[PDB]
Amino acid sequence: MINIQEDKLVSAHDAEEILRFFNCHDSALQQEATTLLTQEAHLLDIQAYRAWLEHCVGSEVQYQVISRELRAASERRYKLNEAMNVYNENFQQLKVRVEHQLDPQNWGNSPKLRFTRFITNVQAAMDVNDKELLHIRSNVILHRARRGNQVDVFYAAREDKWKRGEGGVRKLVQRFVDYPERILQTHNLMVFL
Amino acid sequence: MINIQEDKLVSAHDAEEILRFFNCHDSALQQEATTLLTQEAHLLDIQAYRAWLEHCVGSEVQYQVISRELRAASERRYKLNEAMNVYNENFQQLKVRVEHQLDPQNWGNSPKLRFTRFITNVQAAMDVNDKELLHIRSNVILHRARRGNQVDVFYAAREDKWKRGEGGVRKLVQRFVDYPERILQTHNLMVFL
Amino acid sequence: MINIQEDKLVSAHDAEEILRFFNCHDSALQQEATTLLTQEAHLLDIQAYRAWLEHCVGSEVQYQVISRELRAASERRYKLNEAMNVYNENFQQLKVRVEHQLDPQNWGNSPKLRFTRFITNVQAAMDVNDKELLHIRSNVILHRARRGNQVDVFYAAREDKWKRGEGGVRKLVQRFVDYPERILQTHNLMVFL
Amino acid sequence: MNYNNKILVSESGLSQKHLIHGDEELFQHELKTIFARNWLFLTHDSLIPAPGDYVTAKMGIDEVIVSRQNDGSIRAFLNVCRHRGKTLVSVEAGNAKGFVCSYHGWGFGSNGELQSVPFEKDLYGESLNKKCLGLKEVARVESFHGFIYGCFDQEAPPLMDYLGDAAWYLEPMFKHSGGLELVGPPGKVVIKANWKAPAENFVGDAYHVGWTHASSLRSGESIFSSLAGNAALPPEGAGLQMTSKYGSGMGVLWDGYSGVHSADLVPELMAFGGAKQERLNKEIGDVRARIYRSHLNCTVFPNNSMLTCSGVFKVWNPIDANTTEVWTYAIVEKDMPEDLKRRLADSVQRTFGPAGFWESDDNDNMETASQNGKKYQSRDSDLLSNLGFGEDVYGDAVYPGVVGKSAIGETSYRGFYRAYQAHVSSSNWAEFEHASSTWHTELTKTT
Amino acid sequence: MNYNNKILVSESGLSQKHLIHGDEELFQHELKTIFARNWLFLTHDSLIPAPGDYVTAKMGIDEVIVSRQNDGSIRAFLNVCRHRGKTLVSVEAGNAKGFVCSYHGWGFGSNGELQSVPFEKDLYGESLNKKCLGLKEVARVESFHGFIYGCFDQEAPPLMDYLGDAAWYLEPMFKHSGGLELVGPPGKVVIKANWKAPAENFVGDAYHVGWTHASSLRSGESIFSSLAGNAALPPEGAGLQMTSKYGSGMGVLWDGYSGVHSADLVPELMAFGGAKQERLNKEIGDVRARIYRSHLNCTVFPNNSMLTCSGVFKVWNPIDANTTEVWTYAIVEKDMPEDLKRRLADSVQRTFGPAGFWESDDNDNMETASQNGKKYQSRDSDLLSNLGFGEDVYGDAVYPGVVGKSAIGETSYRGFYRAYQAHVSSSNWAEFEHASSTWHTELTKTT
Amino acid sequence: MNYNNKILVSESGLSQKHLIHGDEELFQHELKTIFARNWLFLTHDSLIPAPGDYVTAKMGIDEVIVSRQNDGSIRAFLNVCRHRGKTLVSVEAGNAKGFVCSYHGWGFGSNGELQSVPFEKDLYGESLNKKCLGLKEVARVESFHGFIYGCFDQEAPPLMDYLGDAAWYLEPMFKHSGGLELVGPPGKVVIKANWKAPAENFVGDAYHVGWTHASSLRSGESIFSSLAGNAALPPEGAGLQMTSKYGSGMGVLWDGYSGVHSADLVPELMAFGGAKQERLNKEIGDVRARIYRSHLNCTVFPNNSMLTCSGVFKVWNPIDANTTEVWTYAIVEKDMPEDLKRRLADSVQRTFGPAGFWESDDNDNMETASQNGKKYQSRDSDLLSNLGFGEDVYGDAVYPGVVGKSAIGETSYRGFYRAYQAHVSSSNWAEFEHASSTWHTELTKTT
Ligand SMILES: O[C@@H]1c2ccccc2C=C[C@@H]1O
Ligand SMILES: O[C@@H]1c2ccccc2C=C[C@@H]1O
Ligand SMILES: O[C@@H]1c2ccccc2C=C[C@@H]1O
Ligand code: FES
Ligand code: FES
Ligand code: FES
Ligand SMILES: [Fe+3]
Ligand SMILES: [Fe+3]
Ligand SMILES: [Fe+3]
């Protein structure tokens, strides 16, 4: 639908992603995706990190959040690394992070943190070549409160791939977030978006 | 699903609540709950507080918002009152608050306040023992603006029980919120979450 | 449902709008509206402004966002212009704004801005007199990030009318927002709500 | 600004410069001359009853750990590690025998002593004089019938003497009733007001109740509901006002034992208080027994306020000139039945807590009055506190202190602010005493 | 910093220290020497036409109530209660005979007088001198053809004299057109810039239009669209610049009556303005009649700006050195048809309002220039305003003021800043006058 | 505060006043005496390798443009337009031959020169001396093996001399390994800490690793994992500490080439580093070859830190006394295979980046220690840095600098703070030199 020569602000990646949802919409798939994401967010909000891994995350997962350097709209010569990886985790790396969260000597976890996630704008479409692969897009507002008066709110769009695995359960096999704020004003990005 | 001995950060209460939604999911109940909550939020947003009471709130309601004291992750000896009640209202107490809102001498209500609510992550399940009782969970972002440049935003998860009453209308019989920010930075918590 | 003599804080306009959704609810129309708004927000989020115009916006559109002067709850004599128009655009005026966004000399657009929209509380009802006119209400949180550390978040309720036009595609023919913050603390309101 | 010479508060405390609610340099100067010099509320025995029990509290902008020692006394220490200055304790309450710093692992006891240093032998050998590295200790910690106050200044008067003439009024409820307990945890909310705004409001502001709280009075159907919208004159002799040398003061509203509590609790309270009053008549006398079931709106200088009977207990914690963190506790009589204690605590929060519908009425008043203090044309303007001036008395035969024999007046503002000028213009307690040698004469002048 | 000696603005206003846009101590000093001393825009007759009508406005950081009296005059008062300092009025506009304070219920009239105090007889007796407790009144309130300005300083010159040579330029549109009305309510947006950044931009910055607004010019198809991207030189004699003794100044762009308005309004405006110009030729002369339909970008010192013809009217309300609250109104000619008035007002907001696509072009420019003023290596650097220096004239036979006979230059910056140094280094109006005795000579020096 | 006389840092750098982490007046004074006087990290050759390549960087609170010239040198300029002070460049990196200001269109070259002014001939004629209007240039720009530093002070020592004794330690990795490249772009996160907190932590804090990072050590299974929870004493001779005249200092942990990297990379790194070490033995000697594959935690005074081997590279950019913007880059050896470079960079961000699980452990420590510095009762308290005092040496036969022959101590804090007092109390470099004439004696005193 989008012609990126006329819609000059639109990236090729973005134009490709949109195409995959405007075509045949499947109301029930949208509903399945809504349920998957709501249950994932519930598990994360109550800090059931082991359960999240066991029930929502696939063994072949790529969990990636990037921070893209600010470059000129008209930049065309400078070609060096465009972004850095805030997260770029395989399942084992996610497990390490989960173990870090659950360790009793993680002093930053006492008193207990409070998380609240808000998931919106869910879209879902099956992949054209892998019929077992489901593309899910959603936006998330994540609120984190700790130590009386620290409050950080995160905002992002998530491009996910989910696939049925062990026991027929649909699990996350890829999550990609291009984090919108270049300089984080939230102390850190130590949250699972 | 959750084993709280392994998922060390998860409370018993939270693990119990999750169990009640992961089991048989009923797509139409999720949709009924979505409608109920959207209409409730609309009534509240336009400040139709009497209508909210008449149409959304059951005579046997318990409307409760707590603030839990920050205690050590490893605390096990100190056993005194764990939280305070920001709200713990029966129907009559809610009516008093509604009358306070509508009184023409409530000076804080002029000029008129502006509310906008965003309800997400709706889950719904019938109770196992009371077949007339519906468990609904949802998250809310509530934006309050007044007097030119005052803006307060509230974030919370709501554990509700709703039951059919007068005329077959499903009404709120219990709302429980464990407010995530210990020290409020919003002037007050004078809003119906 | 609302009697505005008893629900003293409720405006006549608001009471009229609510009536149009409490009556016959149509689950599939709610779902169609959800899809329309999600796709609109996606196009806007990736800055496909030309596509938005072509696919989401009707030739007879009125796109209006007002800022209402703060007046006494009990005011009844002062009768001068109640608000100003932040936006009050026809299709041509929207096109001008879109051209301004895409112009390569719009210096404020380099580096590229980042938008994330969160649409919630969708309600939909057909008009009683024009059977081709769909009333859609939704709330939006719009997050805008630019230049490293500028972050602005907008909050609003949208009263829309959408109608099938060219090719049978449902398009926006009226959007009305009564912006809740009187004094904007976001540098400007240069975003399409 | 020269605080030795600047008249911030006029003679007899008749007026104050509006800038006192907005000036940040003055705020910094108050940290020294008000908060580092005077008695500040910490906690109650009921919150730290057993050895090892502790809470954190603010003292001005400083944070302290308040801990029950093995011998039953209470000591308080700065919540700051003696090594590199990290905040030691990050929770609000708990039980422990010591606190370990999460930076480099130094471990301090409940008594403040440095008890262990990781790898001390290998790293420090015998070079570390641990005896000199204990947490910085609050010099003075004293109790008023279970209520624990701290003072950083070793030269301060004893708390009982500091309470002055106000103590006589508090004793019926605090001592002769059998004792109070504080029900925690507190509500905590930040408001955009100077700490002095709510402090002055609670110390002597009955004038605002009918107008500011018109909506709450009318809606809650509490015992004071007739005042709604200044509809009704309060009777002659409905109460009085008092103030004291060190600044503490209060309003007295005769017989108002159910206080701000809505009609659902009025009958039970009025019965409970009346029965106790009957037994107290024989022990302490009719007058004091009645003070016991009379509503006292009091501020214990500088920033601790309370409403007896209603059971509201507040700390106005200073953050900056237009920011205060409000802590709200409920006070209950220990011999009240448990179910009534529970319901009174909810009612206190319902009315005066984070979503207190009464407390909300006062928000705009306090916030704007404070913020106006920063505005150019208002800085040098005078806030008025002259209501009742020239009718107050000293040394009355029955009611002690500087006393206004009327329910509504500004007696207590005048005493609060006379004490405030004396401190802000003084370098130590001795100078405050010298500046306060004729306090009651200054306050009763034209009478 | 010693503002008597510090050269913040160099001779002839050729440069200014960058710190003036970021220094908070200077901001505080401006409250006194700029905002408490000079004339500030309040409102228009069209907004408070009937007795009892009022609006709130800012004067510097202070808030005032501006009210139409029964006798038709306008008085303005601090929006601050005389008792304990609460903000009296919380709305932006209304109609009333008085204002009651929500704290303790004191009631003041539209004329500022304390008219009632709850329970006055019972509480104050006859001790309250109400005559001395009226709201603090703005000393001077004057009108310029319906536009109402206030000044806290009784010693200020009359507004007409304060406008100096700028008045001659404004009169065709403000007086000879039949009169203007301001269409409210205004847009209100906070920007992270010093108030002087947009003020200097509107007073004499035509140089930026082609580059800063390239995108808007090209997109809107307005009459000035040929300048987009500095594509086109503006003709010789396309306009001029002027400045005056008290700092007010403006750019003049001949014949640009449709101004920034997009093509949808250009034909109707150009017709309307041309017809009026034809009748004005006989009344005020060809030159002034043409000034009437020429686009004036003007700042009325210190912080009120406007674009005649385009109809944009701005107040740059100061909050702190890098914060300003921008109020945006539309100005229309009273004899324009109603439908055209409505559409012009929307067009003003469309271009220059909260979502004004033109105004957005200027955001980064103003915000970063102001914020750079706080940066260490920039504080002592010099902002340049030398464009056209040594070609300006004084006492021209046809165009009054210090005048640059070219559309694009920095004449008006120089006059704005020469007036700013004189005030910041002066203690009162008499000293400003002494510092300004050779103003036009200082400005035309090398010519 | 008189910084000539105030003892902010005690003799031998044994303690520092806690206020140094919270005092805003001191922060302002540091802009002058620390950041405008010393060498600050800008970028790496690998980030701007080709003519026209540029990045923006902070130098203290100032922003600069750092650009590769046609002749191969690098020049840096304030990112501020010479006309009205707008920020010139709004991106972080790019390639260009010049920069045009979006306000009025002035165009500057990559070399800083004012090259074009719109309509110069018509507006300025020949009156504009462009030669005098070039961007304000950073006086000194020098490279340390590809790492580019800037200094606003022309009188500073050359960077190599400034690095002093620390240079000897860095050279094996920075020079003898074949060279490093910095992998951008950096992570950027604001923390609520003073810049000195992380700076002091990286310069000499091995004591905290076992306790602060207990959870990360145990979870990541890195080579230092045995220290988790201070479970294990590190061996005798496991490392050392050093400091230098101009403040730079570092910890040395023998053989820890895989550093904080989790087990997934440990084998490959340990193999890579060991192979290089084998070839280096012949070129630079066994000791230095081992330094090459030993983990150095270093701060290059004042605010640039790094962990060699781990590959972490940080800039602690100052914003205010309790705000710092943390930039995080990855450093890799140029001759490492590309796939390993990619994975090391991800691992650096995984551990120490915006979501670095190690870096998160340190957040509370740094933030609260800094914020406690503002609290009244802590301002005049003493932060301790006496661990190892009286065992440090000067002029060792093998390891240069003031050196502590133990892995864990506070040697490097003492040298960092001795350099900090000398600058804060000095007006220029000559005075710093005079204040530093006996630096190593002051540091080794009791030995
Ligand atoms: O609102 C309160 C109150 C209630 C009831 C009686 C006195 C008072 C005085 C101060 C408090 O603000
Ligand atoms: O952008 C404006 C403008 C438009 C048209 C003519 C002159 C001006 C001068 C200042 C304003 O910023
Ligand atoms: O956490 C780090 C570290 C890791 C490993 C070795 C030394 C250090 C010293 C300072 C850093 O914070
Ligand atoms: S800061 Fe507490 S042990 Fe070091
Ligand atoms: S502050 Fe206005 S009546 Fe008291
Ligand atoms: S501010 Fe850069 S060209 Fe004018
Ligand atoms: Fe009150
Ligand atoms: Fe402009
Ligand atoms: Fe660390």
Side-chain angles (χ1 to χ4, degrees), chain D residues 118-136:
Chain D
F119 309 122
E120 205 198 334
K121 179 75 103 272
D122 288 335
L123 300 173
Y124 293 93
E126 300 282 319
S127 313
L128 211 62
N129 14 221
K130 292 197 290 314
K131 244 85 166 104
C132 300
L133 296 183
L135 304 177
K136 176 164 175 185

PDB file of all heavy atoms in Angstrom, chain D residues 118-136:
ATOM      1  N   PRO D 118      33.980  -6.719  55.803  1.00  0.00           N
ATOM      2  CA  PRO D 118      34.455  -7.868  55.045  1.00  0.00           C
ATOM      3  C   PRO D 118      35.960  -7.847  54.852  1.00  0.00           C
ATOM      4  O   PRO D 118      36.587  -6.847  54.490  1.00  0.00           O
ATOM      5  CB  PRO D 118      33.710  -7.772  53.719  1.00  0.00           C
ATOM      6  CG  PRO D 118      32.448  -6.995  54.056  1.00  0.00           C
ATOM      7  CD  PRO D 118      32.953  -5.968  55.067  1.00  0.00           C
ATOM      8  N   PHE D 119      36.550  -8.999  55.155  1.00  0.00           N
ATOM      9  CA  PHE D 119      37.998  -9.163  55.040  1.00  0.00           C
ATOM     10  C   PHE D 119      38.783  -8.145  55.871  1.00  0.00           C
ATOM     11  O   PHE D 119      39.859  -7.699  55.465  1.00  0.00           O
ATOM     12  CB  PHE D 119      38.350  -9.123  53.545  1.00  0.00           C
ATOM     13  CG  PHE D 119      37.533 -10.063  52.691  1.00  0.00           C
ATOM     14  CD1 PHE D 119      36.752  -9.651  51.609  1.00  0.00           C
ATOM     15  CD2 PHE D 119      37.557 -11.417  53.002  1.00  0.00           C
ATOM     16  CE1 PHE D 119      36.021 -10.579  50.868  1.00  0.00           C
ATOM     17  CE2 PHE D 119      36.840 -12.333  52.269  1.00  0.00           C
ATOM     18  CZ  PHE D 119      36.069 -11.932  51.191  1.00  0.00           C
ATOM     19  N   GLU D 120      38.236  -7.765  57.039  1.00  0.00           N
ATOM     20  CA  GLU D 120      38.895  -6.735  57.836  1.00  0.00           C
ATOM     21  C   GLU D 120      40.369  -7.074  58.107  1.00  0.00           C
ATOM     22  O   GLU D 120      41.243  -6.260  57.870  1.00  0.00           O
ATOM     23  CB  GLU D 120      38.197  -6.469  59.184  1.00  0.00           C
ATOM     24  CG  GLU D 120      38.449  -5.074  59.730  1.00  0.00           C
ATOM     25  CD  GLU D 120      38.159  -4.918  61.215  1.00  0.00           C
ATOM     26  OE1 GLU D 120      37.347  -5.654  61.795  1.00  0.00           O
ATOM     27  OE2 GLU D 120      38.748  -4.027  61.819  1.00  0.00           O
ATOM     28  N   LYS D 121      40.642  -8.288  58.548  1.00  0.00           N
ATOM     29  CA  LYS D 121      42.007  -8.660  58.908  1.00  0.00           C
ATOM     30  C   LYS D 121      42.956  -8.528  57.717  1.00  0.00           C
ATOM     31  O   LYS D 121      43.982  -7.877  57.837  1.00  0.00           O
ATOM     32  CB  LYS D 121      42.021 -10.081  59.490  1.00  0.00           C
ATOM     33  CG  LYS D 121      43.415 -10.616  59.906  1.00  0.00           C
ATOM     34  CD  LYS D 121      43.899  -9.991  61.213  1.00  0.00           C
ATOM     35  CE  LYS D 121      43.765 -10.918  62.467  1.00  0.00           C
ATOM     36  NZ  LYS D 121      42.449 -10.860  63.194  1.00  0.00           N
ATOM     37  N   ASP D 122      42.598  -9.121  56.580  1.00  0.00           N
ATOM     38  CA  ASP D 122      43.421  -9.085  55.367  1.00  0.00           C
ATOM     39  C   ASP D 122      43.594  -7.685  54.741  1.00  0.00           C
ATOM     40  O   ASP D 122      44.651  -7.396  54.137  1.00  0.00           O
ATOM     41  CB  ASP D 122      42.845 -10.018  54.294  1.00  0.00           C
ATOM     42  CG  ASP D 122      43.035 -11.512  54.623  1.00  0.00           C
ATOM     43  OD1 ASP D 122      43.977 -11.865  55.379  1.00  0.00           O
ATOM     44  OD2 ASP D 122      42.293 -12.412  54.169  1.00  0.00           O
ATOM     45  N   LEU D 123      42.582  -6.822  54.860  1.00  0.00           N
ATOM     46  CA  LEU D 123      42.620  -5.518  54.191  1.00  0.00           C
ATOM     47  C   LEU D 123      43.049  -4.390  55.094  1.00  0.00           C
ATOM     48  O   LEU D 123      43.955  -3.617  54.768  1.00  0.00           O
ATOM     49  CB  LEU D 123      41.235  -5.200  53.613  1.00  0.00           C
ATOM     50  CG  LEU D 123      40.752  -6.229  52.578  1.00  0.00           C
ATOM     51  CD1 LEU D 123      39.284  -6.006  52.131  1.00  0.00           C
ATOM     52  CD2 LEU D 123      41.730  -6.220  51.400  1.00  0.00           C
ATOM     53  N   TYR D 124      42.382  -4.293  56.232  1.00  0.00           N
ATOM     54  CA  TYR D 124      42.678  -3.206  57.177  1.00  0.00           C
ATOM     55  C   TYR D 124      43.653  -3.586  58.305  1.00  0.00           C
ATOM     56  O   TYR D 124      44.160  -2.724  59.006  1.00  0.00           O
ATOM     57  CB  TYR D 124      41.389  -2.686  57.835  1.00  0.00           C
ATOM     58  CG  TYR D 124      40.428  -1.981  56.895  1.00  0.00           C
ATOM     59  CD1 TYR D 124      39.394  -2.681  56.279  1.00  0.00           C
ATOM     60  CD2 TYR D 124      40.576  -0.620  56.602  1.00  0.00           C
ATOM     61  CE1 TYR D 124      38.521  -2.038  55.390  1.00  0.00           C
ATOM     62  CE2 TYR D 124      39.701   0.042  55.706  1.00  0.00           C
ATOM     63  CZ  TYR D 124      38.667  -0.663  55.125  1.00  0.00           C
ATOM     64  OH  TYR D 124      37.774  -0.030  54.248  1.00  0.00           O
ATOM     65  N   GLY D 125      43.889  -4.878  58.479  1.00  0.00           N
ATOM     66  CA  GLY D 125      44.714  -5.339  59.582  1.00  0.00           C
ATOM     67  C   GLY D 125      44.046  -4.909  60.876  1.00  0.00           C
ATOM     68  O   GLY D 125      42.882  -5.264  61.172  1.00  0.00           O
ATOM     69  N   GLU D 126      44.789  -4.122  61.645  1.00  0.00           N
ATOM     70  CA  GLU D 126      44.297  -3.562  62.890  1.00  0.00           C
ATOM     71  C   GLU D 126      44.184  -2.035  62.752  1.00  0.00           C
ATOM     72  O   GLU D 126      44.004  -1.333  63.752  1.00  0.00           O
ATOM     73  CB  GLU D 126      45.252  -3.924  64.040  1.00  0.00           C
ATOM     74  CG  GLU D 126      45.435  -5.426  64.289  1.00  0.00           C
ATOM     75  CD  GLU D 126      44.259  -6.049  65.044  1.00  0.00           C
ATOM     76  OE1 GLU D 126      43.770  -5.383  65.996  1.00  0.00           O
ATOM     77  OE2 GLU D 126      43.789  -7.179  64.680  1.00  0.00           O
ATOM     78  N   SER D 127      44.278  -1.521  61.525  1.00  0.00           N
ATOM     79  CA  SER D 127      44.267  -0.063  61.298  1.00  0.00           C
ATOM     80  C   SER D 127      42.892   0.608  61.432  1.00  0.00           C
ATOM     81  O   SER D 127      42.825   1.829  61.580  1.00  0.00           O
ATOM     82  CB  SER D 127      44.806   0.268  59.900  1.00  0.00           C
ATOM     83  OG  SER D 127      46.005  -0.446  59.637  1.00  0.00           O
ATOM     84  N   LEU D 128      41.806  -0.181  61.316  1.00  0.00           N
ATOM     85  CA  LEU D 128      40.441   0.365  61.399  1.00  0.00           C
ATOM     86  C   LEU D 128      39.933   0.512  62.846  1.00  0.00           C
ATOM     87  O   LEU D 128      39.761  -0.468  63.564  1.00  0.00           O
ATOM     88  CB  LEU D 128      39.471  -0.494  60.572  1.00  0.00           C
ATOM     89  CG  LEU D 128      38.271   0.242  59.946  1.00  0.00           C
ATOM     90  CD1 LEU D 128      38.704   1.311  58.953  1.00  0.00           C
ATOM     91  CD2 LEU D 128      37.343  -0.746  59.260  1.00  0.00           C
ATOM     92  N   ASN D 129      39.733   1.753  63.281  1.00  0.00           N
ATOM     93  CA  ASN D 129      39.174   2.012  64.606  1.00  0.00           C
ATOM     94  C   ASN D 129      37.634   1.981  64.523  1.00  0.00           C
ATOM     95  O   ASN D 129      36.982   3.020  64.410  1.00  0.00           O
ATOM     96  CB  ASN D 129      39.687   3.330  65.196  1.00  0.00           C
ATOM     97  CG  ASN D 129      40.389   4.227  64.165  1.00  0.00           C
ATOM     98  OD1 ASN D 129      41.423   4.849  64.473  1.00  0.00           O
ATOM     99  ND2 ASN D 129      39.825   4.321  62.955  1.00  0.00           N
ATOM    100  N   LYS D 130      37.073   0.777  64.568  1.00  0.00           N
ATOM    101  CA  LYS D 130      35.618   0.586  64.398  1.00  0.00           C
ATOM    102  C   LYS D 130      34.812   1.365  65.416  1.00  0.00           C
ATOM    103  O   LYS D 130      33.693   1.807  65.137  1.00  0.00           O
ATOM    104  CB  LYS D 130      35.262  -0.887  64.472  1.00  0.00           C
ATOM    105  CG  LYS D 130      35.784  -1.662  63.295  1.00  0.00           C
ATOM    106  CD  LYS D 130      35.102  -3.005  63.142  1.00  0.00           C
ATOM    107  CE  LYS D 130      35.504  -3.951  64.244  1.00  0.00           C
ATOM    108  NZ  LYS D 130      36.986  -3.898  64.436  1.00  0.00           N
ATOM    109  N   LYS D 131      35.404   1.541  66.592  1.00  0.00           N
ATOM    110  CA  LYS D 131      34.777   2.262  67.679  1.00  0.00           C
ATOM    111  C   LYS D 131      34.446   3.699  67.295  1.00  0.00           C
ATOM    112  O   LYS D 131      33.578   4.320  67.910  1.00  0.00           O
ATOM    113  CB  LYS D 131      35.722   2.290  68.880  1.00  0.00           C
ATOM    114  CG  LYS D 131      35.200   1.568  70.112  1.00  0.00           C
ATOM    115  CD  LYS D 131      35.504   0.074  70.039  1.00  0.00           C
ATOM    116  CE  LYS D 131      35.311  -0.641  71.367  1.00  0.00           C
ATOM    117  NZ  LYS D 131      34.024  -1.454  71.368  1.00  0.00           N
ATOM    118  N   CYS D 132      35.151   4.226  66.298  1.00  0.00           N
ATOM    119  CA  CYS D 132      34.939   5.588  65.843  1.00  0.00           C
ATOM    120  C   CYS D 132      34.079   5.669  64.576  1.00  0.00           C
ATOM    121  O   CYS D 132      33.836   6.751  64.065  1.00  0.00           O
ATOM    122  CB  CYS D 132      36.295   6.227  65.562  1.00  0.00           C
ATOM    123  SG  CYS D 132      37.339   6.248  67.052  1.00  0.00           S
ATOM    124  N   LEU D 133      33.649   4.517  64.077  1.00  0.00           N
ATOM    125  CA  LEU D 133      32.929   4.449  62.817  1.00  0.00           C
ATOM    126  C   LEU D 133      31.497   3.987  62.974  1.00  0.00           C
ATOM    127  O   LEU D 133      30.941   3.402  62.056  1.00  0.00           O
ATOM    128  CB  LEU D 133      33.639   3.508  61.892  1.00  0.00           C
ATOM    129  CG  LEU D 133      35.046   4.035  61.541  1.00  0.00           C
ATOM    130  CD1 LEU D 133      35.670   3.114  60.570  1.00  0.00           C
ATOM    131  CD2 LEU D 133      34.937   5.404  60.955  1.00  0.00           C
ATOM    132  N   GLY D 134      30.902   4.234  64.124  1.00  0.00           N
ATOM    133  CA  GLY D 134      29.503   3.858  64.305  1.00  0.00           C
ATOM    134  C   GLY D 134      28.607   4.859  63.548  1.00  0.00           C
ATOM    135  O   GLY D 134      29.063   5.968  63.246  1.00  0.00           O
ATOM    136  N   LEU D 135      27.354   4.477  63.252  1.00  0.00           N
ATOM    137  CA  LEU D 135      26.420   5.387  62.516  1.00  0.00           C
ATOM    138  C   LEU D 135      26.269   6.659  63.292  1.00  0.00           C
ATOM    139  O   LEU D 135      26.346   6.639  64.537  1.00  0.00           O
ATOM    140  CB  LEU D 135      25.054   4.714  62.336  1.00  0.00           C
ATOM    141  CG  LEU D 135      25.113   3.346  61.634  1.00  0.00           C
ATOM    142  CD1 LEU D 135      23.739   2.712  61.564  1.00  0.00           C
ATOM    143  CD2 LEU D 135      25.703   3.436  60.241  1.00  0.00           C
ATOM    144  N   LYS D 136      26.050   7.773  62.601  1.00  0.00           N
ATOM    145  CA  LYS D 136      25.889   9.050  63.272  1.00  0.00           C
ATOM    146  C   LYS D 136      24.571   9.000  64.057  1.00  0.00           C
ATOM    147  O   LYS D 136      23.531   8.714  63.481  1.00  0.00           O
ATOM    148  CB  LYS D 136      25.931  10.199  62.276  1.00  0.00           C
ATOM    149  CG  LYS D 136      25.689  11.572  62.852  1.00  0.00           C
ATOM    150  CD  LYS D 136      26.158  12.629  61.846  1.00  0.00           C
ATOM    151  CE  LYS D 136      25.853  14.032  62.271  1.00  0.00           C
ATOM    152  NZ  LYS D 136      26.200  15.010  61.234  1.00  0.00           N
TER     153      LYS D 136
END
